[PDB]
Amino acid sequence: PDVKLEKTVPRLHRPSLQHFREQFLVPGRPVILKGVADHWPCMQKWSLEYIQEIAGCRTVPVEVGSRYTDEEWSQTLMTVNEFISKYIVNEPRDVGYLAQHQLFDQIPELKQDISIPDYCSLGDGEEEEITINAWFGPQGTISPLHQDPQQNFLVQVMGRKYIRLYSPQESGALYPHNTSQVDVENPDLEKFPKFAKAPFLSCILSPGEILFIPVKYWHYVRALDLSFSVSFWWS
Ligand SMILES: O=C(O)CNC(=O)C(=O)O
Ligand code: NI
């Protein structure tokens, strides 16, 4: 998608903690951190076949469908192997996603391949209550526009994701059902008049990069290739 024609998220190579707290965290402004996670072992070490070997056997919850309404999506328990088989390799017809699952409690060994970003300590909370999630799905997975109740560090390990960001002081034009009723990349201009002209920031997130997504900031995600991401929810 055309990102050179959109306002893009600012990228910074290893900004100091102070400059992050003051210019981003406190005011709640997105930023892309560069050269912080890119040498994490996960970056080299996590091929499709690496994961398939070590995790292939474990049972994991799988999203079929997109999350616009509760009734509009469903989950299924299968193995990583069944999942990789049915929704990734060869020619998968339907989409399925391994979203928002805590793989690193299920498999503490993988914890050595990632770190907790230093920037987290600027928050009030304790490292132990930080919620790490895995997001592992094929190209074409869509997580609809919504906001989380915490600060977020989303780390991209494998593949690229297109991400769009609307601030919270912009909720009006987004039409909450929280989560939006708008389809960011195919919007009903008339059902939703106020949306076309709401200001956003966007980005293509690549391997090695971290997107800071400020608490309650609205975000929408579409994967551009086979993808693996790790999120840190923190306060
Ligand atoms: O990675 C995705 O598809 C969606 N991730 C998020 O909504 C999250 O990390 O906050
Ligand atoms: Ni989210």
Q: Which residues contact 125 (CB under 8 A, 6 or more apart)?
A: 234, 235
What does the DSSP 8-state code read for residue 142? E
How many angstroms from the chain centroid is the CA of residue 194?
26
Resolution (in Å) of the shown entry? 2.8
The alpha helices in the chain, defined as continuous H runs, are: 17-20, 42-45, 48-55, 80-87, 103-106
Residue from 193, 231, 234 nearest 114 by CA: 231
What does the DSSP 8-state code read for residue 150? S
**CB 28, CB 215: distance < 8 Å:** yes
Residue from 68, 66, 32, 67 nearest 213 by CA: 32
160: enclosing H helix or E strand: none
Q: Residue 128: CA atoms inside 13 Å, Cβ hemisphere, count?
A: 0
Residue 16 Cα to ligand 2 middle (Å): 26
Residue type, 85: S
Mutate to test the pocket of ligand 1, among 98, 101, 229 (most ligand atoms within 8 A of CB): 229
Residue from 77, 4, 28, 22 nearest 212 by CA: 28
Residue from 154, 215, 212, 207 nearest 40 by CA: 207
| Pocket around ligand 1 at a 6 A CB cut-off | 135, 143, 148, 152, 154, 219, 221, 229, 231
**Ligand 1 atom 8: the closest Cα is on which residue?**
231
Token duo for residue 57: 């056997």
Q: CATH second-level architecture of 1-235?
A: Sandwich (2.60)
Name the one residue in this structure whose structure tokens are 């560090």.
Answer: 153
Q: What is the per-residue burial (b if ≥16 Cβ within 10 Å, else e) of 89-106? A: eeeeeebbbbbbbebbee
- Packing angle between helix 80-87 and helix 48-55, nearest 10 degrees? 140
188: enclosing H helix or E strand: none
**φ and ψ at 231, to 5 degrees?**
-100, 145
Residue type, 226: L
Please give the Cα distance from 223 to 204 (Å, whole number).
Answer: 9
Token duo for residue 45: 């070490």
